[PDB]
């Protein structure tokens, strides 16, 4: 099964949904026979320039071990979710959980 | 194209157990399993021509192995072309 790198930000105005938001994804990968390899809340983070408004923002990243559709189905929730402006997936090359 | 799990399917059934992938049945079934996939991908788009250049090699290489199959063992050969369902 492919491993993927899932990084998505919840707007600082949306900082509370992160506990509610991720667990649904936790049920989202746990459902598809895959699991989580690394789940860290980096917290709100400053951004040098506004994305059509506002600086700074809240970051969340999580690595997955799950099939393409749960990868693909998960990417569906993000587009609709205006709270999660961007998450883009990178690489598999085995799963790792480290660094900061 | 085809997934590794779906690639694993074709080797066993058209081969001697799961380990006979050098059997032309594995490729042709793999190839037969593939022409239909891209046929699906080519059914849409119609704009993936250069990948259709990936399309023909399957059809032509499919012709090659079956015609290769004909000389080696027809009793085996007749099995697959019906088994792969082409020609009239």
């Amino acid at each position: 099964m492919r491993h993927y790198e899932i990084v998505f930000m919840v707007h600082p105005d949306q900082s509370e949904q992160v506990p509610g938001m991720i667990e649904r994804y936790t049920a989202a990968i746990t459902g598809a026979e895959g699991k989580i390899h690394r789940l860290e809340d980096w917290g709100r983070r400053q951004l040098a320039y506004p994305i059509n408004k506002l600086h700074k923002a809240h970051y969340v990243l999580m690595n997955v071990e799950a099939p393409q559709e749960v990868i693909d189905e998960l990417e569906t929730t993000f587009r609709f979710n205006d709270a999660v402006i961007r998450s883009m997936v990178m690489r598999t090359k085995h799963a790792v959980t480290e660094a900061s | 194209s085809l997934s590794t799990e779906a690639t694993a399917k074709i080797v066993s059934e058209f081969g001697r157990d799961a380990n006979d992938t050098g059997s032309t049945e594995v490729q042709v079934a793999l190839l037969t399993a593939q022409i239909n996939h891209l046929q699906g991908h080519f059914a849409e788009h119609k704009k993936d021509h250069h990948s259709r250049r990936g399309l023909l090699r399957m059809v032509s290489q499919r012709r090659k192995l079956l015609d290769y199959l004909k000389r080696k063992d027809v009793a085996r050969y007749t099995q697959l072309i019906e088994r792969l369902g082409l020609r009239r």
């Binding site: 990084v7 040098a48 506004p50 994305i51 961007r86 | -």
Partner: protein, 55 residues
Amino acid sequence: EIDYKDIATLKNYITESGKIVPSRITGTRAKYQRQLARAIKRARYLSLLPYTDRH
């Protein structure tokens, strides 16, 4: 470079006006500089490295 989330070091690859500095002056591996752009243009919409100071 590796990731778009660490704009702190990504900033050394940008001039003060937001145009990405040539990696030739910065050096870095030939492949590594590409990862910078992947974290910059597309991740723009994530607000990683500023356009410039106009507004």
